[PDB]
Write a protein that binds this DNA or RNA. Structure first.
Lengths: 116, 177, 68
RNA sequence: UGCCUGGCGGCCGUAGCGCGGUGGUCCCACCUGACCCCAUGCCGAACUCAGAAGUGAAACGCCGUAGCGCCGAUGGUAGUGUGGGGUCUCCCCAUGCGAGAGUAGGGAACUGCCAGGCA
RNA sequence: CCUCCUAAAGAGUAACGGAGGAGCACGAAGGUUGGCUAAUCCUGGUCGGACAUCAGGAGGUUAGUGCAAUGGCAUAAGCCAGCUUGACUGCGAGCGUGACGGCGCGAGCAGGUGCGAAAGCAGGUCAUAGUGAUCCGGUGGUUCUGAAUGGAAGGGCCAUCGCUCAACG
RNA sequence: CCCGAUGCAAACUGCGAAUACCGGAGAAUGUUAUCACGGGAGACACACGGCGGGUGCUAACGUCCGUC
């Protein structure tokens, strides 16, 4: 199945990066919205996140998920992480392709102060 | 959308009246058509395979894709990974054009055309059959015929069972059995 | 002859870079601070206390060394 | 703080298979077009781009259903260490540890963080 | 030399035992990143009889994993593709193996590289047989040395080649 | 060729311990009975019996393995 294929593809990289026992960044791409989260080495807690689902980001966005929305989510997550001080967590692209808006959001995070 | 709009306008209403579905798109819909070729005698040389691939490319709007043998058997003298034929998958407007042109003109112009075999289904609601002597299509010019071959057209349908497949096939008026 | 089997067990002190278990196949997989050689000979990447766990949907067995 | 939907972990079939009901508040999914970001060893199949046009059909979510999978006591049984005996090929006695299978019982799982709607 | 039992739950463990397999090979059959997942059965059809490609379903690794075999592989260790040769240089704590020389694994360090946006991986092959210690000979490099001196011969060091000694520490 | 039932398999285990091996804590006793190095040894055709086994015709008062 599509979801099964995606999760099986993602879990390999997830475990590979978890072997280091380091913080990770996971971004889920949805046709409507975009989800972002930072996961501690424990794996059962959340530190920083920001998604277009909340109304706090849709004021300047005509559509839930697009280039502008992806950039805004990148800025929001970067600012929240910097104020919280995640200190250069790792990045995982939810077992997806780094070819679409994933690249845009990654570049936005990097230029916003992310060292991943 | 040469026929997609017309299909939605015409077939959907009649089928909904037939079954009285609660959703517009619950009607079974065609997804793709598999244009395989069961020559079974291309082992002699690659020239026949190349000719068949060229014929399929001319028939459709895109180049075909060759396929290899699943397994090696001794009775049929087949090795492993041997390319025996090629197939085409149509999704979008090319599939609609192919279906419209085959239903409109190709179906009537068949000698001793006893009709499509209704029982010849896949057991779940999809139909697959091979109309031999593909020369019927004008695209295969008579002067450009090398050997007699046969087609393998399979219609991909979302039918839950065979009844929905029968209903969808009849929606195209099913010339006769 | 070839020496196979397990030579370090649960609760057994092991120094850094010490072989834990030998195996022709992979009856165990690295957990935390555990490596994996070309011959599947498990070894510890740091000093600690050995331990065996059962994890995974398929009920696999892993060897993990808890930090001292 | 109560209900619904999503992501992140443990637990790894007490979480599974099947049947019925049910879902468009938000969210999610199907999907139109792709000449544009992008891709097909052909195919918009999969990834990606612009949406609510239409729907919850299908996947998936929740409740019930113990038909079906699993564990599983208690007892008993086989087995076995220790010392002895017999009719010593094998078995028994005192003591300790005690199977497999199966029975009662269970469950249609549970658990921690945040987010959106309903309150 | 290697695979399961014999070999009696650590390892090892006799016998003129049961079954046997090998002296290979790869400059891709390796590394990196990406995508994918089968044996088998039924239904329908042009050669098709029970077994050619295809469509669907059941099936969910019972195939494949180069070797005869064992234990593993779904995050696939299998398949396809973009690049490359980290199969690099000097090393290497510690551990295991054995009577022993010796042998295997090995995190990590310094220099420069390949892949990947990065995180990260790359010091050969899913692991377990493919080997030949020993002196002698062919080649090229190296003032290292040269029986008083300048050289020469000779010696020393570096890299490759001659093997059913199948009886093969 | 395949399926249901019925028995077995040292070269089958979806299950499986008593016992022996290793690791940690612990009251008690043992002339440190444990370990490293150095000097000096002897032996290098063992028998019988119990235990679980291979071979042997499960005939053996036959033979070969590990423990006592």
């Amino acid at each position: 199945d599509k979801k099964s294929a995606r999760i099986r593809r993602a879990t390999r990289a997830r475990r590979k990066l978890q072997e280091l026992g380091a913080t990770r960044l996971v971004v889920h791409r949805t046709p409507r919205h975009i989800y972002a989260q930072v996961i501690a080495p424990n794996g059962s807690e959340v530190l920083v996140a920001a998604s277009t689902v909340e109304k706090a980001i849709a004021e300047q966005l005509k559509y839930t998920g697009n280039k502008d929305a992806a950039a805004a989510v990148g800025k929001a997550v970067a600012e929240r992480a910097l104020e919280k001080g995640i200190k250069d967590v790792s990045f995982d692209r939810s077992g997806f392709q780094y070819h679409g808006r994933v690249q845009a959001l990654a570049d936005a995070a990097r230029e916003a102060g992310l060292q991943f | 959308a040469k026929l997609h709009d017309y299909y939605k306008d015409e077939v959907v209403k009649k089928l909904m009246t037939e079954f009285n579905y609660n959703s517009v798109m619950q009607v079974p819909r065609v997804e793709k058509i598999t244009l395989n070729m069961g020559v079974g005698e291309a082992i002699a040389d690659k020239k026949l395979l190349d000719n068949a691939a060229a014929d399929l490319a001319a028939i459709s709007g895109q180049k075909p894709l060759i396929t290899k043998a699943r397994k090696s058997v001794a009775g049929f003298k087949i090795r492993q990974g041997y390319p025996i034929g090629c197939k085409v998958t149509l999704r979008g407007e090319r599939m609609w054009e192919f279906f419209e042109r085959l239903i409109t003109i190709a179906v009537p112009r068949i000698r001793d055309f006893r009709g499509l075999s209704a029982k010849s289904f896949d057991g779940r609601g999809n139909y697959s059959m091979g109309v031999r002597e593909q020369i019927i299509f004008p695209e295969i010019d008579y002067d450009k015929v090398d050997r007699v071959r046969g087609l393998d057209i399979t219609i991909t349908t979302t039918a839950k069972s065979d009844e929905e497949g029968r209903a969808l096939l009849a929606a195209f008026d099913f010339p006769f059995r | 002859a070839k020496r196979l089997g397990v030579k370090r067990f649960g609760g057994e002190s092991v120094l850094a870079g010490s072989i834990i278990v030998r195996q022709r196949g992979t009856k165990f997989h690295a957990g935390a601070n555990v490596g994996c050689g070309r011959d599947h000979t498990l070894f510890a990447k740091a000093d600690g206390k050995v331990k065996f766990e059962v994890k995974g949907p398929k009920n696999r067995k892993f060897i993990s060394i808890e930090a001292e």
